From a paper:
The spike (S) protein of HKU1 plays a crucial role in cell invasion by binding to host receptors, with the transmembrane serine protease TMPRSS2 recently identified as its protein receptor. The S protein of HKU1-B forms a trimeric structure, with each protomer featuring a furin cleavage site “RRKRR”, akin to SARS-CoV-2. S1 comprises four domains: N-terminal lectin-like domain (NTD), RBD, subdomain 1 (SD1), and subdomain 2 (SD2). S2 includes the fusion peptide (FP), the heptad repeat regions 1 (HR1), the central helix (CH), the connector domain (CD), the heptad repeat regions 2 (HR2), the transmembrane domain (TM), and the C-tail domain (CT).
Both 1up-1 and 1up-2 conformations contain an RBD in “up” position but with different rotation angles.
Author numbering:
A (entry chain A): 51 to 298
B (entry chain C): 646 to 794
C (entry chain A): 795 to 1221
D (entry chain C): 1043 to 1221
E (entry chain C): 299 to 397
The structure:
Amino acid sequence: VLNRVYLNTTLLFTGYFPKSGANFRDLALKGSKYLSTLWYKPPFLSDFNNGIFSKVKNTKLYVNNTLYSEFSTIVIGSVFVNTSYTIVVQPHNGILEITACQYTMCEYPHTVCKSKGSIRNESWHIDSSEPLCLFKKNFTYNVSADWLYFHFYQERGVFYAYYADVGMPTTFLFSLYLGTILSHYYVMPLTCKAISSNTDNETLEYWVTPLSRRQYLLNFDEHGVITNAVDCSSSFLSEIQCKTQSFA
Amino acid sequence: NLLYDSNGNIIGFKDFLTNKTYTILPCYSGRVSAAFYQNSSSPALLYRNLKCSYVLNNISFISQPFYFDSYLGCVLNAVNLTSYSVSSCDLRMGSGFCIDYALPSSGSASRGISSPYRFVTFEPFNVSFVNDSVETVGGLFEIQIPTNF
Amino acid sequence: TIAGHEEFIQTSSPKVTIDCSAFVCSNYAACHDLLSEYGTFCDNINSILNEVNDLLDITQLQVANALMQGVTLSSNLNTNLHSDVDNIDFKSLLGCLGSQCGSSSRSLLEDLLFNKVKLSDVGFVEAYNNCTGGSEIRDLLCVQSFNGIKVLPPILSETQISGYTTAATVAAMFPPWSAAAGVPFSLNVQYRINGLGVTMDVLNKNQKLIANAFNKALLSIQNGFTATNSALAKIQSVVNANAQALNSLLQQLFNKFGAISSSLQEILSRLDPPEAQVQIDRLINGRLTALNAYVSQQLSDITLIKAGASRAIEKVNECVKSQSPRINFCGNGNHILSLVQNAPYGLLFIHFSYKPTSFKTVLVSPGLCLSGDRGIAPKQGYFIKQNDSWMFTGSSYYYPEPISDKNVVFMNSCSVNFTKAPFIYLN
Amino acid sequence: LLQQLFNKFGAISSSLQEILSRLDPPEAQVQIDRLINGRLTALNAYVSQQLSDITLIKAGASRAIEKVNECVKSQSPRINFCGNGNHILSLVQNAPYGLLFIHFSYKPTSFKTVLVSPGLCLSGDRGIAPKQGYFIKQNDSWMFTGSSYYYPEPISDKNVVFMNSCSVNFTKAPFIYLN
Amino acid sequence: PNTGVYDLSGFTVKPVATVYRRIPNLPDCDIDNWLNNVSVPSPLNWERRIFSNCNFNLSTLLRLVHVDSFSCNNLDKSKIFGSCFNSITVDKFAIPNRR
Ligand SMILES: *[C@@H]1O[C@H](CO)[C@@H](O[C@@H]2O[C@H](CO)[C@@H](O)[C@H](O)[C@H]2NC(C)=O)[C@H](O)[C@H]1NC(C)=O
Ligand SMILES: *[C@@H]1O[C@H](CO)[C@@H](O[C@@H]2O[C@H](CO)[C@@H](O)[C@H](O)[C@H]2NC(C)=O)[C@H](O)[C@H]1NC(C)=O
Ligand SMILES: *[C@@H]1O[C@H](CO)[C@@H](O[C@@H]2O[C@H](CO)[C@@H](O)[C@H](O)[C@H]2NC(C)=O)[C@H](O)[C@H]1NC(C)=O
Ligand SMILES: *[C@@H]1O[C@H](CO)[C@@H](O[C@@H]2O[C@H](CO)[C@@H](O)[C@H](O)[C@H]2NC(C)=O)[C@H](O)[C@H]1NC(C)=O
Ligand SMILES: *[C@@H]1O[C@H](CO)[C@@H](O)[C@H](O)[C@H]1NC(C)=O
Ligand SMILES: *[C@@H]1O[C@H](CO)[C@@H](O)[C@H](O)[C@H]1NC(C)=O
Ligand SMILES: *[C@@H]1O[C@H](CO)[C@@H](O)[C@H](O)[C@H]1NC(C)=O
Ligand SMILES: *[C@@H]1O[C@H](CO)[C@@H](O)[C@H](O)[C@H]1NC(C)=O
Ligand SMILES: *[C@@H]1O[C@H](CO)[C@@H](O)[C@H](O)[C@H]1NC(C)=O
Ligand SMILES: *[C@@H]1O[C@H](CO)[C@@H](O)[C@H](O)[C@H]1NC(C)=O
Ligand SMILES: *[C@@H]1O[C@H](CO)[C@@H](O)[C@H](O)[C@H]1NC(C)=O
Ligand SMILES: *[C@@H]1O[C@H](CO)[C@@H](O)[C@H](O)[C@H]1NC(C)=O
Ligand SMILES: *[C@@H]1O[C@H](CO)[C@@H](O)[C@H](O)[C@H]1NC(C)=O
Ligand SMILES: *[C@@H]1O[C@H](CO)[C@@H](O)[C@H](O)[C@H]1NC(C)=O
Ligand SMILES: *[C@@H]1O[C@H](CO)[C@@H](O)[C@H](O)[C@H]1NC(C)=O
Ligand SMILES: *[C@@H]1O[C@H](CO)[C@@H](O)[C@H](O)[C@H]1NC(C)=O
């Protein structure tokens, strides 16, 4: 919660949360040379209703005993043209570049792993004119982290973003007034040379679940860290847990 | 910068200017007990669970010549006489204590300026006692038998 | 052998007093001005709770009157010296009595019971003493008492009730014997056992086993208040019920009742006087409703507590101070006697009883028709045939003895299903 | 209860006569509703008080029926039920909203100090116990006295209960073979 | 009055002083410069500015723009004067005549 600290207590709190007992969905794609057009279809091009929660694997490539962090970039928007704004979250090996602009997006976009470069060139937009941008910022993340976590949602025309690189609960990154309604997202394929099983045995993972406004019971320990949570409408045990405001 | 509890109050903070951390507690709130006997000019007053130091320094600055500390709290306008016992009490203060009233008489008018209220002990029930032994005196027991009725 | 078991009866409860305008309108002047035009709503709530607390004090003095009615003690009695009679040790049952101790103690059975209960009557006082600071940071009792909810002490302290029960327990032991029918404790034990069908020869020859069984049952009573005792759960349900009622009453100060906020500070820092009134009115109505419902519940619980206190007074009168000819009143049949000890918000009775262990199968007759067409029936026993002679045995111990007029009740006629026994003109 | 007809309950007046002479029918209903709710709440609270007092009245009436049945109309072998112990009998009279019971009791005035025994061990190792009273030693001879009046008298078979053994702390007395 | 024990109404310990904290040397919100900006939007593409981490007052704001009417809702005007807020969102557009 925003600038509040809670200490050794349970709290009944309604927020933009996932649903306990639902499914994730690994929407990461890898390629080498060819790009199938069904990679860009409404199985993969999903819906952004209230938001998404997403769990991201940080693939750690190696060149010359030097670490390189890599994962897939995500693009959020409504029509993905240059009359509407689209949000792009893209990593650059320890630097998370987040931009909200009027991009002229390619039909079959992708990115390219920079440590061991690929066959193709990185091409998700073509814009030599530097379009209008509501937001442009650079954040820095832990390179040695295994898992990254992202909350992305919208509320009353405003887009909100939370993130975590150390631990599972997230903290607030940025908000942005748009005035419009975003309706789709898409995780892009990261085209690489050496990630598969004949190489060093690495994997792309990008798991997405939907978000909705709902009530949890949260458990804050003595240092104020969220340690446990229960969705109040997932089972009968969770109903007992929320009506007693207890975990046991 | 703000510490909360589950009911939604602020219970502590950290200063933006000095980076110092503080907790917050509420200010003291309570009432007074007044033991009042009829046709008197003032009641006797009890501050329950409070010291008289706190009472004179933080509650009232008015004139009170008589005050002492008791197990029940701070007593103003009464005399500490808890060595003396009373079996019928109409101002019973709790946990075995009483407020007694005794105005100075015509002939029994002690010239020392005091309060007519005393703070005494409440003890309503008793046993009867005898002056006989508790063991056998040569095998036989000592006992008290009625001779008239 | 002699069995023993304990039983808690509840005679009181914590005395809650409530400051009504402090609960509804804590410090804020606009709220108090609005509460003044509700009339006599707060005075009625205060009056009902004062009536309940007067009833609690009346019943406390009635229990104390039952414990002290008609007991005469030796003025030489000093329980630092006198704690044993007839090889039965009453040391853990008595507090202090005597003009060289100073009546400022409990017995250790009372101390074991009173240390597992934190919020007793002295625990409330010494907890409210710590509310100028919290004594670490905070406590729930201080938040309650700053919002106008306090627990008052009872009008008698608990060391006075412990002195009452100490004098009652010691009136059974020592030579006035005002609670043991004017005869000593071991004599009264033998007469109450003999009145069940057990002959006096067995009880004269098994006196030390009776004393050791008493001490064994007492020591197993003392080492038994360990996390599964049902009387301890009975005692702690009282404290947990009081704490849940007061915490759920304090949680009513955080409902909105249809307003914009549950805080008067927030409404008075955001709105105008013609607009803050409409919001303060709903909080007033909701908090007064919660107080009214709490007051109705306390009114119906004091009647249950008075029924329990009247049962405890009857048990002190007819089980502890004397022993009735009522069967299955205290205990269960084969009841011998009772003792009483002071418990948090009530009394604890110890019932001692007769317990058989081994058996023997006897063929018995309920009556003998003698020559002359007369009859005899056994007086709390049966007729048995031992070595082809008719004999008497009591119904609760196997012991044959000669048929005399002290075992029988005569009849000038005889019943039809009496056994004919013409050989009998014995003693 | 009658004082609740002069509370405002947060309205403009406590009188329906004043409210109905100042306001229109749609506007007066808001004021009347507050009076109606407050007065019904006051009646419900009165009814709760009466419901709680009738339980204490029924308990006291059942105790009075017990005392009529077992202290006035007969006398039970219970001790400390009527009166205090040393109780003799009761009479009953009619009182406003109840009964008046008059309990009569044996009250001792003057007392005496005696040395008593609780039971004798006779020869043959038989034993006698006193029947509601004590064995006292008068003129160096064992006698019986009842417990609530000092009157020495012969040890007979109507003052005792008999035992074929004698307890260990009893007093040995071989000089008794008396009536 | 009769002989009795009376429990009187409640006292609170009176506050001695005030602690007052504000952040010094913050910028000016300049709500008048955006309110009196030249380019005025229609109601269809109405504009928003967020003002945070600054200092404002309503006196200069109401004597620098030419006020026809200043009404408030769920707040009172005199409650704004010493206040602090997390942000202020100001939307602006021009008013059509018939609407
Ligand atoms: C965020 O950081 C990235 C990486 O440090 C910056 O990207 C580089 O910017 C320089 C300067 O324009 C370019 O010459 C490089 O080609 C960029 N790198 C890549 C991989 O494209 C980026 O400019 C930073 N963002 C901001 C807003 O400063
Ligand atoms: C209180 O702590 C903050 C930490 O956030 C201090 O702010 C830092 O100040 C130093 C030197 O002034 C800068 O190098 C840092 O960049 C500041 N941190 C941030 C996040 O801006 C602040 O100086 C401390 N105040 C006092 C009085 O010690
Ligand atoms: C009034 O608003 C306009 C925009 O509606 C401001 O125009 C900006 O001016 C700055 C230079 O001062 C440029 O860098 C921006 O790119 C302009 N924005 C646009 C959208 O054109 C104008 O400056 C404002 N007036 C004042 C006095 O500040
Ligand atoms: C109220 O706000 C005005 C600005 O709208 C403040 O006026 C500024 O005052 C400082 C010194 O007081 C000057 O240096 C600035 O040039 C002023 N700006 C303008 C636009 O006039 C004013 O100070 C504020 N009121 C108070 C009491 O501080
Ligand atoms: C943890 O919470 C419990 C709540 O019952 C509290 O008693 C305990 O003091 C807390 N621990 C710390 C370190 O604050
Ligand atoms: C890795 O090391 C080799 C040998 O030193 C060097 O030729 C190569 O350029 C290095 N890779 C990069 C990306 O610099
Ligand atoms: C990628 O771009 C570089 C420079 O523009 C060019 O040399 C290379 O051939 C390009 N690759 C493809 C597949 O077009
Ligand atoms: C996060 O970064 C710190 C310092 O850069 C490092 O000590 C820590 O191990 C990192 N977290 C993980 C999960 O590697
Ligand atoms: C990748 O996994 C296979 C397991 O089938 C193993 O044989 C191979 O050596 C692994 N290679 C690397 C670089 O880990
Ligand atoms: C004392 O009070 C009574 C009220 O019952 C009153 O009648 C009487 O006059 C008073 N006496 C004095 C001396 O004031
Ligand atoms: C009141 O008197 C008793 C007995 O004289 C004494 O023990 C007690 O300390 C006195 N109270 C105070 C506050 O001195
Ligand atoms: C015992 O209590 C009674 C209560 O009426 C009292 O009158 C009596 O004086 C007390 N006994 C002693 C020795 O003080
Ligand atoms: C009565 O008791 C006193 C001490 O309380 C004692 O001195 C006196 O001898 C006793 N009287 C008799 C007759 O025993
Ligand atoms: C008993 O008391 C009465 C009345 O005082 C008196 O006349 C009578 O002589 C007394 N009897 C004895 C035996 O003292
Ligand atoms: C008998 O009396 C003596 C004292 O005279 C006592 O020591 C002993 O314990 C008593 N025994 C029994 C069984 O009562
Ligand atoms: C009250 O506080 C003191 C010290 O602050 C502590 O020793 C005592 O045990 C506390 N008592 C209770 C009942 O909290």
